[PDB]
Amino acid sequence: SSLSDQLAQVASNNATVALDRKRRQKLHSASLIYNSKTAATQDYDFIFENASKALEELSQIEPKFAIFSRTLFSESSISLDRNVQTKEEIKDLDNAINAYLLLASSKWYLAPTLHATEWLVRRFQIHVKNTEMLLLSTLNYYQTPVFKRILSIIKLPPLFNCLSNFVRSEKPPTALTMIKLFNDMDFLKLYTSYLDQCIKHNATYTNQLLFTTCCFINVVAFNSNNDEKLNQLVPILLEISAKLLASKSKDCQIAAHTILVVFATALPLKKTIILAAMETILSNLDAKEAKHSALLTICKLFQTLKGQGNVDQLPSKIFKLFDSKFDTVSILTFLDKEDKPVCDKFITSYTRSIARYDRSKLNIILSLLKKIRLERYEVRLIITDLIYLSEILEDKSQLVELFEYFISINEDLVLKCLKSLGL
Amino acid sequence: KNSKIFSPFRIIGNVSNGVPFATGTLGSTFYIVTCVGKTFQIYDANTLHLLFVSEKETPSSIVALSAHFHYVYAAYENKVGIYKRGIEEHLLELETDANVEHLCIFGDYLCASTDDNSIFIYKKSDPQDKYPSEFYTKLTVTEIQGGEIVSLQHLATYLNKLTVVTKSNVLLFNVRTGKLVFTSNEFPDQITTAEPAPVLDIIALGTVTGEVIMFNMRKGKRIRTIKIPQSRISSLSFRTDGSSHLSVGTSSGDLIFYDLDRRSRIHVLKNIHRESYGGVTQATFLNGQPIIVTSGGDNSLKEYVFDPSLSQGSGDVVVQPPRYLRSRGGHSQPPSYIAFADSQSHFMLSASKDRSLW
Amino acid sequence: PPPDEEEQLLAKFVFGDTTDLQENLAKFNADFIEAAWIDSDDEKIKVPILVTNKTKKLRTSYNESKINGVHYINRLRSQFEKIYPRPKWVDDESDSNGDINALTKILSTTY
């Protein structure tokens, strides 16, 4: 390539180095709270005193910051520099810095965290060396003056061209532009990596999770047209869904529920994939409002399933698991509620499973079919499995009363099925 | 039947016909050897020029190929030819009646394999010579140990050992004394492709079902199993820039890139070789460079690259999908009409029956 | 005599050593927020080294010139590890009520 371009690359490699006094004054005057002149004049020591006071306040709120007080905020942390050390110690510093940003992600509207992060900014040059974790751990706060300050400071990586246009102005970016950013693809991959590490360190918060799920749902909502784009988007979003369910909080699990339901209604998936997702939900379901959300999204999953084998039964282990996590009286009451999501496909599959697998709770089958109005082909399907259960099982007055209910409702259909097989 | 006015000059405009090609190393560059009909050709790897072509047509069509440094080893019907710069330097008359199927070249040895489970071992004469020339011995593969011979490799760091992969198991041979010294256990499928790793004692077997089986040999206990469904795996290769990338090429014409450290499907290429002409018969990563080269049976040799990533810190999790790069090839079905271009006789128009003109 | 703890502390401060901070960053964890076949001729064999560039790389001391098989192949293993690095997947992993990983498993299966 050309000489000018290669010198531009060497300049980018030497962004951080403070060669002459002009470059030092520039790099120093870049800072977070203070404006130009005052940021230029004040010294590391005064910065570090302010930082230490802020860190004592933060450890008073929560004790996880004794680590950074021990390591990144001491006397050698005054003395040291990035641009002197060997690359492996550099990688260890990047490890500790990313730990800091992850752990301070959940306090960003407080002057204490603001000041300690200004220490990291004005000594470890993080706003030039590793801007990625700064932007991504501070993304959801996208209407706040602290984010406006970081936009006026930072130098963007070539994944963020939208914010790269919005740098250095008076208006915060808009949700449309955020949705452009998340409509990009490699950025989606990078965000999955960050969220994976965040879960595996087990520190998320509600606004963080809410912003993530709203961005993902709008991304799929835009891409409702290009099916090939949805097909290349499936592994990304569903693997973030699987890790998010693997987390142990009600917050994580409910968020993953919303992502799954909007994806399932946006694109018709395969039945085995649907069953695997249900298997994860049931295998990690823990709390009460979690049970509520899980039942709703399971219902919507089987509802948006449409194809051959639409009304097939649950496989055995799945059916045992589902009943065990879902006692029958609870789902009865949920049916008795007023909100009443559409439920016919899933409920018919459930009762056909109870028929072929349980062989006892036909009375509960009777009451469920009492409470909900179903469809014609479903009625014939129920009738088929009940007919075969009659032809095998030793007879029962409960089976008598069930067929009595069907004679009271659609006896001609019953006789049609007997004309298919029987008397 | 001889001629008296004309004489055969060369057969123009071919690259491959589906016989698995080989990659050779000189100094710190590379080159590609392929075979067409009764001859073989040698191409450049940085600009894809035509560097060499054999100068004697063979009495049969060439079936097996491999390459050491300067010499290239070709194997037609019964003999084995040892070529240098396309000039025929040596014959190697085999003492059987069978047809020779696969080939390996390592150390003071050449290992040739026919169809009837017969492994011929040629020894180097004196280590100041460059190719083996003396007949040494003849191992056999009895049917009670394993079925038909599939391929022959040689792992890193095994003194006079040889790796035979058969239909049902793998064998570790000691060629010095001449004893089968290790056998593995029967595998339920038909093993079709083999490749050693850039790590120790690790071999890779590709079956007819979508199983990539990463196998140990110092222990003999298949480490990893990766599944591709609804295809028959046709070749493997490893990346060696320093990432954990594994490249699998099916017969249906796709290409799939996994990562081992993440168990992941990084990417997939769709229809780069036509299944109606034999499928992806040889796909190889060049050693330690972000360059992959594929060759089909549809008379085509392409090579793609991996782009360096767009993250700054994260990197190996956000890897660019491959892009397209150099390519040579010609007709698929035999041509139908030609004509010359001008009175310097330079360009040849030709339109073929797969609906294109070059 | 070795100096005690306060003398160590003052020494580190007044000389401005940063080895403590480096070992602290090193120990920094976001943790908390045989064989089965023998080769008799390989144990019997005696090979030379001094023939050319390759085994003269494999040499270890200046006096030795012929080395037998087990040390030889072990040296070759060391050399191969020098050239091709070892990745963590092959140093560690083996595949060995319903679980959690079923969704990711079916996702990695299907195309």
Binding site: D184 | L159 | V47, Y84
Partner: peptide, 28 residues
């Protein structure tokens, strides 16, 4: 403005390898 995708050039850099002709050896 979105992400720009300028696929930059490639250079076949140098490499290093292994050699079976020094894998093998001779009887005593």
């Amino acid at each position: 403005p979105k992400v720009v995708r300028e696929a930059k050039k490639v250079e076949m850099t140098e490499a290093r390898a292994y050699n079976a002709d020094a894998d093998t050896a001779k009887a005593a």
